[PDB]
Design brief:
301 residues, alpha+beta, four-stranded antiparallel sheet, binds protoporphyrin IX containing FE, binds magnesium ion, Peroxidase, iron, heme binding, Dyp_perox_N
Amino acid sequence: GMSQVQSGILPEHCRAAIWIEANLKGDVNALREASKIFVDNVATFQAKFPDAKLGAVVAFGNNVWRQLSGGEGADELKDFPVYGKGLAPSTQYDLLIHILSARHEVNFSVAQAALAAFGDAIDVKEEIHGFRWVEERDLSGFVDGTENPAGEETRREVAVIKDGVDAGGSYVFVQRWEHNLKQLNRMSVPDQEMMIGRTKDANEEIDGDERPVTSHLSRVDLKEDGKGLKIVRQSLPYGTASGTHGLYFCAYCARLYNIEQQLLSMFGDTDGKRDAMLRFTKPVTGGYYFAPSLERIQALG
Ligand code: HEM
Ligand SMILES: [Mg+2]
């Protein structure tokens, strides 16, 4: 009589992922059997490819989750709002599928399985292939992940709802960024470091009172009476060298509150200042989703 977390929230250092964002085209009922088929497929792929260390998550937007849940629980869930009066655009969809593992080829098979399960019930809006880059750096050349919650125990504490109807579930935030690396390369390395809040090559934290309040770390390293507002990030670089490229931002949290506070901070709603990264990169999508526990995906019918 307990709850199991979906397999894709907690894994650390996976080298590849696929994110599919889609709208519900018909009766929301179609999502019931599809979701059950999908998590069964994941179990099948985990059995066939034990060395892939595969995990996946199926999550739902506010409108369809209120229908599937009958309005019970997920009290913080809402459509992703526009932040900074539009600085952060809003592209709220109905369904999010997140696949991650040590093997892109296995991820690809799982994505095909997801598409076959949901079939013509969904309208795919975005499919992004994330890849870990050299030294786990973002395409900007700064290491991404250093202060991310480490270890299953702490990641569970931060990402997984502990009790009540939603025990084992999590809130998910996805936001695709498009980097302008030409604009970045116009900046001196010291200017870039003051924009992030860490040194570039050695990845050393710059002290809070040495770095601008607009620095990324100053915007998102938030505390409430000394307790950090932590989140579990699963973000990865994506794109082509000659085309669109950037960071696919993805975070999980037991409370949507921690994510929203960081967004209000970055986009100027809190103190009128905004994240210095907007000098070379911008968000073009945005959505909030609820990732139920595995057994509730099994109580979908
Ligand atoms: C272009 C988009 C982004 C880039 C390139 C980026 C990059 C980075 C880098 C380089 C770090 C420092 C190393 C680390 O501790 O991980 C960092 C930290 C962090 N980022 Fe971001 N980030 C982006 C967007 C976001 C967004 C949208 C959020 C939250 C809403 C976020 C939340 C955080 C948090 C919580 C940390 C850890 C801060 C700390 O406690 O030290 N980031 N990011
Ligand atoms: Mg800190």
